[PDB]
Symmetry: C4
Subunit: 251 residues, 4 copies
């Protein structure tokens, strides 16, 4: 009777803590519960779609609080699997983890909201999505790659920033009188920031020949300097994962 | 007489199944037939260009049904080339392939449409374009590269998503009263999604100083996090094809 | 007297044919002459800026025809440097080159225009910019890298195309009645093509909740599939030039 | 007494000249002083936000002139650390550096402005941001990578430029009569430049079927050719920093 006990204890510990394969099926369905509750709470703030949305948001919040309740409780129970945490003192030593106090605070708080209501419920679902990491693996991966490429990212930002100020000043000089778009300097800076990221809202565009002649040169230079750091970090991620594949095929 | 028989049988089998060189000339012209029929069927749904379009769409549909008819029939006939499929039982064993039932269902269905008509014909040309793979080589290439980079794509989406929600909430707080663009939260989320992908329709843009000060920081961070996964998969494809070139120059 | 003769002959042959270093100074100034004549001819087609533009365009066309005249004539004269072309028969054997007939046809044609006038002159300056290669080095570099990555570019285009048709059909179904933007299918296809390339003109945008819910998912998938082939060819160019640097540092 | 003297002299020399770690904390706070003075001077040019902005801009300019004063003076004093510059003649030999005359000219000039006033102060803060390099490390890194990839950047610009002229001419031919957007050739060139960089202001868009049919093909080709050089330089930066990591892990 203890055999199937400990066998399922390590099975649930490996599905609830670091998973490998079809355990991501369970982590995807819990992410779909918190994502569907987030979208439905967005549909609840509109005045005309409020009745249908909250009519389903009540049962979906009860379902999410139950599913998170049993997943927390059997994370504590399946923490008795591992060779370090075992026993009453070991399980309560797992209660000493600050992430477990965070998760139990959120869970009792969702009971308290279900005992500006929907805005607090929306804050609690956002914090459950931040809770989904439990290890900062996304933050640590981004921090390692950003720190590895710090000289090129600073170079891309610094040269793009100086091109932004030069382009905005030259266009403002060209189009101060003949255009109500470019009334002050700050309007030229907002035009340059929206153009050089290739957003292009269209509320401000140069309408003289001087502004179009100057912006034609500076757009070709500047949008490259602003599209750089996505390319630098993109190839940094791909090179890092390629060498990890080779350093896995050895060991 | 059997020599030229089997010689042309393997020639047509290698042009109709996996081709190498100038056989892609034939596969490009059949793709141009289905693409020209798709564009002309789009021109047929407009009320003022309907007579010219359907006047040519009749003969182009008869041509496409004939060309696909002979290509199907001599795929069955040239399946007698290969050392496994040969004979009446072997050719009908090639009829047992589920892709061949799919192709023969589409072909008889285009006869049935030529015996909401143009919308069904348009569905049949779309399914012929999906039929153009016959092996899922595009889906299998994308699936291998996406699965290889799953940790970075999840990191890019997760951090870009949290930046989207923070930027949309801060801009909404800044511009709830002084702007009819940002009336509810869902309008701030639609503004953030359209800006951070650098679409920039222009229907919603921040018009205060608070919204422009907050969106200036978050646009520089967020558009990088949304342009990441195209860079990650782009360098993943290029690194994969470079190592396949080196592992072809050995063997 | 023959020594300085042949020394300057090889010097001018190496500045006019394949240059290395500060000879690109001369090729940049001739490109600036043809670029300044192109921009000034664009300023000549506007009715209010026509007098100033053509007043300078006359002398700039005479200058460009003289500079190209002496560069052609001393390309023929400095073709007597190389060990193959030498003598009257050798120089006229260089006249047999089809690129030299192209260049001499353009040069006599610019005399003929200077003996719908400005539009023909604008065509002649465009063809001089195509003449600037003389070897197709840009076309051959692009053709080698595109042919090396043909399977991924076809995969990116094919999957982006199917996502475009699915997104445009779902948005059209959502917004046929409640929006004059999406009146026919072809308007939904034009909206999808302009959004998924992240242009975002703003003339068509979805205004219901159905269209915004469907376009929110498909924009995140589709703009990645359309930004792929610039990333694939960008990393293809960078990987190719890195290996050429290593295969130069050996030999 | 000389021991702590020289120990702190090399400590301050290594925090003020080439820093490594937590010395970038000090260089980040001085960059935040000049960035906050730049943003506040932008808020000062608007007529309605002028009183609050200049009320804080006075004390922030006095603070920046004091902090830069002591940092200059103890850069001269801590230049006595290094084994070459030491003594009265050595410190004044460091005054002979042209960057030190630049920095002392800016500092006395900010005293002179504090003895079109705010525009000159804004020019002086911009030149302090250019002064932040002191070595051109950003310009030298960009120049090395741009020079390494000069053949591909010229290929990307040349082929994108020819696609721009062909697309603009074909769209202009299609939409000269039926559209007030495309009145002259120069309006077609401005439409093509804004579309092919995927800005998409929306002031000019093709409204016929001819212009939309031609722009549909040329947008898919052209936006790739314009997004190329950001991808080429992005992967150039990532490949360069990867090989420098490997050539640091050896030595």
């Amino acid at each position: 009777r203890n055999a199937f006990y400990r066998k399922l204890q390590n099975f649930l510990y490996n599905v609830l803590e670091r998973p490998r394969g079809w355990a991501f099926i369970y982590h995807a369905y819990v992410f779909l519960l918190v994502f569907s509750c987030l979208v439905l709470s967005v549909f609840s703030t509109i005045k005309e779609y409020e009745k249908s949305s909250e009519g389903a948001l009540y049962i979906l919040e009860i379902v999410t609080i139950v599913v998170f309740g049993v997943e927390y409780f059997v994370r504590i129970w399946a923490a008795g699997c591992c060779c370090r945490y075992r026993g009453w003192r070991g399980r309560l030593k797992f209660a000493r983890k600050p992430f477990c106090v965070i998760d139990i605070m959120v869970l009792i708080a969702s009971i308290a909201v279900l005992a500006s209501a929907l805005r607090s419920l929306r804050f609690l679902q956002i914090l459950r999505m931040i809770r989904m990491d439990r290890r900062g693996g996304t933050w640590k991966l981004l921090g390692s790659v950003v720190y590895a490429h710090s000289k090129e990212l600073v170079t891309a930002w610094y040269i793009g920033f100086l091109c932004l100020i030069l382009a905005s000043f030259l266009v403002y000089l060209a189009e101060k009188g003949e255009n109500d778009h470019f009334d002050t300097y700050a309007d030229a800076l907002w035009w340059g920031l929206i153009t050089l990221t290739t957003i292009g809202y269209g509320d401000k565009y140069p309408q003289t020949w001087n502004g179009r002649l100057l912006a034609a040169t500076f757009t070709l230079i500047g949008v490259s300097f602003f599209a750089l750091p996505a390319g630098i970090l993109g190839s940094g991620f791909a090179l890092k994962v390629q060498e990890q594949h080779r350093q896995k095929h050895f060991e």
